[PDB]
Amino acid sequence: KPLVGTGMERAVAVDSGVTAVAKRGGVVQYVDASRIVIKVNEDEMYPGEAGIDIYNLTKYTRSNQNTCINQMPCVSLGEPVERGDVLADGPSTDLGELAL
Amino acid sequence: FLKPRLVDIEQVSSTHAKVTLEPLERGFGHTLGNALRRILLSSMPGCAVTEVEIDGVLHEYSTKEGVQEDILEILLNLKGLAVRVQGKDEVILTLNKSGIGPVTAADITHDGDVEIVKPQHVICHLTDENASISMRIKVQRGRGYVPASTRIHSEEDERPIGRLLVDACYSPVERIAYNVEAARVEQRTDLDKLVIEMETNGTIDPEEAIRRAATILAEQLEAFPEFDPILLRPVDDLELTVRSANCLKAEAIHYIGDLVQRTEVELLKTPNLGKKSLTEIKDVLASRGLSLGMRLENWPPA
Amino acid sequence: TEFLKPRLVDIEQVSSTHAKVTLEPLERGFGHTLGNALRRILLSSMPGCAVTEVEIDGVLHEYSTKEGVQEDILEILLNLKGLAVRVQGKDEVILTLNKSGIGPVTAADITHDGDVEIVKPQHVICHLTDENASISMRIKVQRGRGYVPASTRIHLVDACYSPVERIAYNVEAARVEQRTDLDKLVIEMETNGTIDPEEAIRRAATILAEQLEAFV
Amino acid sequence: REEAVVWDILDEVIREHPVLLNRAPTLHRLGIQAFEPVLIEGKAIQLHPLV
Amino acid sequence: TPEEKLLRAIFGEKASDVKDSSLRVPNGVSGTVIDVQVFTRDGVEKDKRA
Amino acid sequence: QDVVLGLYYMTRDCVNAKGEGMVLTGPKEAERLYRSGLASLHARVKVRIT
Amino acid sequence: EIKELLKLGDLPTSGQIRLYDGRTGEQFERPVTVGYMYMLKLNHLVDDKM
């Protein structure tokens, strides 16, 4: 994490697709290094299909620079999450901020 | 010409302590102290975990289903596991756990020389009801920093690909600081004290470390072409069948030189060698310009 | 978990009072601790006897002029500090400078005693100008286990005990077979000629070993 | 195979055999200078400060 | 050539009609293989590994 | 750069320091005076040099 | 504000503290600036360039 920051790194980290952002608020049903399954709150939820938002995290794979691109879950089993929150960090990102 | 000695060793924590030395002459607190700091930080026995074979894992770059930690993260966590052994230079432990919840360092099977200083230490978490992880944690003892990269030269069939090598963190010492304050003993002109306040992981006693440090320090003062190469190759280089190799080794034939001395008669007299095996051996030897009943006269030189 | 001792030495010495000794194998970071600790001990603490104080025949003070010598008394005192004295079981000895003439007073012009030994006869104490130039004095030596200046005597000549004139250690990379990097520790010393640099190193670090005799 | 002996052999062939060092913007003739090789563990070239 | 012909008949080695084009790890780089993908022309028989 | 700041910090003088005004036989015991922490690196001093 | 946040940390206003050589153990003359800088590793890595 940057110890000396700006306040932009959060925006740079989140707005860029590297991090995995919650589509809808709720609680986390399942937290794995592979996937993260979130049970959606009824208010944000649509009438049909019920449903839960399941995010499949990208794991170790080739980047364009021949580096590694990998995601890690920043959330714990059965944790409150809000819409537009970081569920997982991409490479070189810490808790929704940008660590270069 | 007064020689120093130790005094009250104050243990403030499992982590760290302050060792002290009373009888120090003029300026010697620094000369002894810093030199002691050096050897303390650098050279010390350590037991840091080396090899780890996990359940379904071929490489450290995968993720096991049921654990939110990446395998590499789990190795990096293990590297920070502090253990102390007594009679064994290298012990192998076995970790097993399942169900939802954190897997700590106390979840391993306890062995004779195993002492876990941090039972609360987190190896990895468990996210699913039925998900289980078993692993062999191979812990050996050494000095200094031995990275995983330099560990492979010797090689010699580390083939169990499920075994991931990790960097060696061997060293009890974290932080060592020495302060000299004037120490007034009852009667004496002026003497100094040595307060060495050290930081450890708990796997080494203060008196022990402070002892070996000066032990090594003083320990430094102790001075202050004919014949075929192919004949010495192991039989495995012949690339025979497992049966033939084991049979030859059972007949005290460990190298090619040993094999080329034997005759067909002698080999057929062995309890386990049939005509097929002999055919194979003659074939592989002939394929490299060798044979049975070869004399080299002078087995061996040195 | 066995350790590494050195295995290659080659004391290359210039002349007699000067020496440059070297050691090839040495574990990483051991060269600096060894070099430094031995340097500290070598410089600050060492046995030896030279000059503490010398009475003045002509005047009562270090600030004055002698008939027959253009050198200031302090100047001659510096010269006396540069005199090599090695004494035997006698703890404090005293010599005399009796001599006169149209030429300089050397270290061979001093009086010969039983337990006294001067290593350098060519050493210059002071010059003697024209005529008789009355000169002779008594010189008292003393012992120390470090360096004690003239001001340090509170209740005058600077007493130079430690034979070491100059001590330096140079640490360079040491290559042994399949071991990547080791230390090579080169100790270079200059002494006053009383005790030879070679043993001087031994006794020096021997003090270190005595300091550690309560631990290992 | 990089057998342990060859290294010492290299130490022989390197001794009095100089090498040439050069930088990208070569202007004056000093842009290329000859030195004597000293074997180093690392992938980087060590260049004397005064140069 | 002649010396090679002598060499082969002395040592009795069949010189293969096949040259080794195998893909090998570039000199100096050392890592762990985390993935393998095999692409086959449509209609050509897939090998064992594939 | 580093070197010239070294020789600059070495060869230089402040108004008052350890061993100010004293006298020494030569550079040897000057350095010997400095390294023992008795005399400051930069101090006004008369010394005999050859 | 920086010095004021240094007060809350028990650390000096100067940002400079005393440092001791890990070699001779002696103190360094003058205070030196120590702190925490965010540093990046660019990818020019030598085993590529060489």
Side-chain angles (χ1 to χ4, degrees), chain A, chain B residues 2-225 228-282 284-302, chain C residues 1-215, chain D, chain E, chain F, chain G:
Chain A
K1 119 213 55 179
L3 227 290
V4 183
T6 55
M8 282 295 294
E9 43 270 284
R10 194 152 238 277
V12 173
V14 176
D15 287 16
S16 187
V18 274
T19 196
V21 178
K23 301 167 188 167
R24 292 137 66 187
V27 201
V28 208
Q29 185 207 14
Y30 183 59
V31 189
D32 195 284
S34 309
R35 58 161 64 91
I36 298 182
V37 198
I38 295 279
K39 177 175 275 290
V40 191
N41 294 329
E42 290 210 339
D43 33 319
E44 304 176 2
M45 195 156 55
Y46 260 83
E49 217 166 49
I52 62 271
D53 293 320
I54 172 176
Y55 310 144
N56 299 272
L57 265 49
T58 305
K59 303 311 295 190
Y60 304 78
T61 173
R62 155 145 181 274
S63 72
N64 270 3
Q65 264 51 47
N66 271 8
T67 76
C68 171
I69 158 181
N70 183 38
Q71 283 180 320
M72 292 162 45
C74 65
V75 298
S76 55
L77 227 177
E79 174 182 338
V81 304
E82 192 142 76
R83 197 211 185 281
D85 229 317
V86 277
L87 264 285
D89 287 329
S92 245
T93 57
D94 179 276
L95 282 182
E97 297 179 330
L98 170 74
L100 312 92
Chain B
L2 2 166
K3 68 172 36 87
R5 212 196 167 281
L6 65 145
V7 70
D8 163 79
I9 315 178
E10 182 199 310
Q11 200 96 23
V12 71
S13 177
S14 177
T15 65
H16 88 90
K18 306 199 314 269
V19 321
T20 313
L21 301 72
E22 192 95 304
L24 283 182
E25 282 194 320
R26 165 198 312 276
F28 265 180
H30 287 298
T31 303
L32 275 182
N34 182 58
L36 276 185
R37 182 188 186 264
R38 167 75 38 86
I39 310 308
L40 264 175
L41 285 178
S42 70
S43 309
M44 292 301 305
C47 340
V49 48
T50 301
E51 311 188 353
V52 176
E53 188 173 6
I54 326 185
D55 200 53
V57 204
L58 297 291
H59 51 63
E60 40 189 330
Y61 306 99
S62 66
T63 52
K64 204 276 186 51
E65 170 59 38
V67 46
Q68 65 176 357
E69 279 87 333
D70 292 80
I71 301 296
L72 190 275
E73 198 182 355
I74 307 174
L75 290 186
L76 263 56
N77 276 322
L78 282 171
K79 196 177 299 177
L81 182 49
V83 81
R84 175 174 55 194
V85 292
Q86 301 146 44
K88 285 183 172 183
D89 269 13
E90 72 184 57
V91 63
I92 316 172
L93 288 71
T94 299
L95 184 272
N96 271 280
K97 190 64 179 303
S98 60
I100 306 184
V103 180
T104 67
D107 288 24
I108 330 176
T109 311
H110 183 268
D111 197 70
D113 292 310
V114 167
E115 178 175 346
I116 305 302
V117 75
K118 38 195 317 181
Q120 310 91 333
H121 189 43
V122 43
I123 277 63
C124 70
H125 297 182
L126 246 301
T127 188
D128 190 272
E129 288 203 8
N130 53 321
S132 191
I133 39 169
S134 57
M135 66 192 69
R136 273 179 291 282
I137 304 179
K138 204 287 298 184
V139 167
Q140 69 176 30
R141 231 165 37 169
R143 192 177 63 260
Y145 187 81
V146 179
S149 175
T150 51
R151 292 249 300 113
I152 175 170
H153 172 83
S154 56
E155 202 182 25
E156 291 218 324
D157 207 80
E158 71 169 53
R159 196 273 312 163
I161 44 190
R163 284 189 171 274
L164 292 313
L165 307 83
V166 321
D167 306 81
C169 194
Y170 315 134
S171 206
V173 294
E174 199 82 296
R175 174 190 311 169
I176 275 75
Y178 76 104
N179 333 303
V180 297
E181 59 186 311
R184 309 306 181 187
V185 72
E186 198 65 32
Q187 172 68 275
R188 189 47 170 169
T189 53
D190 62 319
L191 291 186
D192 296 306
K193 196 177 302 180
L194 185 47
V195 175
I196 301 174
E197 178 176 348
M198 74 168 57
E199 175 64 43
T200 336
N201 49 338
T203 58
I204 277 299
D205 318 281
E207 195 171 2
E208 168 132 329
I210 216 62
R211 178 185 314 278
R212 217 162 315 199
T215 294
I216 306 167
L217 195 171
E219 169 173 12
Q220 293 289 355
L221 275 314
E222 191 176 325
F224 266 136
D228 213 308
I230 210 182
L231 289 182
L232 50 63
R233 282 182 174 267
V235 287
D236 288 337
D237 290 30
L238 285 179
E239 304 168 353
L240 284 165
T241 55
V242 171
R243 176 195 168 186
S244 293
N246 287 335
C247 290
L248 291 178
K249 291 180 180 179
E251 299 298 322
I253 306 178
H254 305 341
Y255 301 96
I256 296 179
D258 301 316
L259 176 60
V260 296
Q261 290 180 118
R262 309 303 187 93
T263 181
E264 178 183 0
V265 212
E266 172 177 5
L267 290 180
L268 288 167
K269 289 175 180 177
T270 58
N272 314 313
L273 288 171
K275 293 174 178 206
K276 300 178 178 180
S277 292
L278 261 295
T279 299
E280 176 192 354
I281 295 177
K282 293 181 181 183
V284 66
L285 285 182
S287 72
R288 302 184 65 168
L290 301 172
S291 78
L292 296 178
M294 285 184 50
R295 226 188 31 267
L296 3 296
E297 95 94 15
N298 278 225
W299 225 226
Chain C
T1 65
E2 311 172 32
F3 235 93
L4 215 204
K5 296 169 183 194
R7 211 196 310 168
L8 186 267
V9 327
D10 169 81
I11 164 179
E12 185 270 312
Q13 75 177 21
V14 188
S15 73
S16 175
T17 181
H18 178 90
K20 204 194 188 163
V21 196
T22 90
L23 308 167
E24 245 218 54
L26 241 264
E27 290 266 320
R28 166 138 68 84
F30 270 68
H32 265 297
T33 174
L34 282 177
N36 176 57
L38 272 62
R39 187 195 95 267
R40 299 193 96 265
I41 299 190
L42 262 172
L43 196 178
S44 288
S45 34
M46 213 58 193
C49 337
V51 180
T52 297
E53 29 189 359
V54 174
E55 43 93 281
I56 321 295
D57 53 293
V59 207
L60 198 266
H61 298 309
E62 310 96 329
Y63 52 101
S64 288
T65 176
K66 194 46 187 306
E67 295 274 284
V69 183
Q70 355 80 246
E71 281 88 331
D72 283 78
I73 305 191
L74 54 145
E75 206 99 357
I76 307 174
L77 290 187
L78 265 55
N79 280 86
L80 287 173
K81 290 186 301 177
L83 193 52
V85 188
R86 43 207 291 191
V87 203
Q88 296 276 42
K90 190 121 170 286
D91 190 275
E92 300 188 314
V93 74
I94 190 171
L95 286 72
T96 213
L97 278 194
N98 171 72
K99 165 64 185 306
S100 266
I102 329 179
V105 182
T106 71
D109 283 326
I110 326 177
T111 210
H112 324 77
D113 303 330
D115 293 308
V116 179
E117 179 176 346
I118 274 58
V119 83
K120 256 192 58 179
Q122 299 172 252
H123 196 275
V124 172
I125 292 173
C126 71
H127 295 339
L128 245 42
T129 194
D130 65 273
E131 210 203 7
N132 294 37
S134 57
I135 192 70
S136 176
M137 70 194 69
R138 272 180 230 93
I139 166 180
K140 192 193 164 184
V141 307
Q142 195 174 28
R143 300 182 150 177
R145 297 175 177 168
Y147 183 83
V148 178
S151 62
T152 310
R153 219 68 179 135
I154 180 174
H155 237 160
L156 298 74
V157 177
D158 297 78
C160 41
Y161 304 119
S162 82
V164 292
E165 287 194 45
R166 178 183 171 85
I167 22 76
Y169 75 108
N170 334 301
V171 188
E172 53 189 72
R175 160 211 180 93
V176 177
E177 201 144 21
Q178 283 151 278
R179 310 265 289 169
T180 300
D181 67 303
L182 292 316
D183 294 304
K184 198 175 171 181
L185 182 50
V186 179
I187 268 62
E188 175 170 345
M189 184 167 55
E190 301 189 277
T191 55
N192 53 0
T194 62
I195 178 55
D196 70 285
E198 174 170 358
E199 179 211 347
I201 302 169
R202 308 186 179 279
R203 226 159 72 199
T206 294
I207 307 168
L208 186 62
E210 290 273 12
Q211 292 282 310
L212 288 194
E213 201 175 16
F215 305 102
Chain D
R1 204 184 328 279
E2 293 192 10
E3 300 186 6
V5 279
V6 309
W7 296 112
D8 294 340
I9 303 294
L10 197 152
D11 276 329
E12 297 184 41
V13 299
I14 258 53
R15 251 174 60 88
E16 309 286 62
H17 192 146
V19 296
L20 264 48
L21 253 68
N22 182 29
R23 199 193 129 94
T26 313
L27 275 304
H28 61 327
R29 61 186 229 177
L30 296 179
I32 302 186
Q33 268 173 285
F35 290 86
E36 207 164 76
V38 175
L39 274 307
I40 289 304
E41 301 268 343
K43 309 206 181 179
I45 298 177
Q46 312 225 318
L47 168 68
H48 194 272
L50 294 180
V51 197
Chain E
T1 66
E3 287 85 356
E4 307 180 60
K5 201 167 186 298
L6 165 74
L7 190 65
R8 297 301 198 278
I10 291 178
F11 283 79
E13 251 177 34
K14 294 191 182 65
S16 205
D17 293 320
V18 80
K19 186 175 177 56
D20 167 49
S21 292
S22 62
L23 166 65
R24 32 190 86 244
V25 176
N27 206 96
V29 298
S30 305
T32 310
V33 172
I34 61 185
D35 190 21
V36 168
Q37 295 296 329
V38 170
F39 304 156
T40 307
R41 172 170 304 278
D42 209 327
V44 183
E45 178 168 273
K46 317 159 182 294
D47 58 53
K48 185 168 189 170
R49 168 112 200 196
Chain F
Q1 41 197 40
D2 293 41
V3 38
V4 324
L5 177 57
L7 274 96
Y8 174 86
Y9 187 88
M10 216 204 331
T11 288
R12 171 63 181 270
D13 64 328
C14 50
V15 64
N16 181 21
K18 284 183 175 181
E20 158 102 23
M22 74 190 307
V23 287
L24 301 89
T25 181
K28 293 178 182 175
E29 82 173 29
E31 180 191 61
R32 169 150 30 91
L33 251 292
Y34 170 57
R35 289 293 287 158
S36 58
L38 292 179
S40 171
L41 188 50
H42 31 53
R44 307 127 143 201
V45 164
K46 284 205 178 192
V47 291
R48 172 189 307 185
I49 65 105
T50 302
Chain G
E1 301 170 283
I2 295 180
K3 318 294 194 54
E4 194 190 283
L5 204 262
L6 274 164
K7 301 173 183 177
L8 185 56
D10 266 336
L11 330 157
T13 283
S14 304
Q16 299 175 319
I17 336 184
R18 48 177 58 82
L19 256 66
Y20 300 79
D21 195 345
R23 306 184 298 179
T24 58
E26 73 193 31
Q27 195 193 55
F28 281 114
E29 327 191 355
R30 317 178 79 222
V32 310
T33 296
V34 296
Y36 277 69
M37 178 182 292
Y38 202 54
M39 275 187 48
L40 306 321
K41 175 186 174 180
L42 322 174
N43 50 342
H44 284 20
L45 311 79
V46 61
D47 31 44
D48 286 336
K49 296 301 187 178
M50 190 207 71

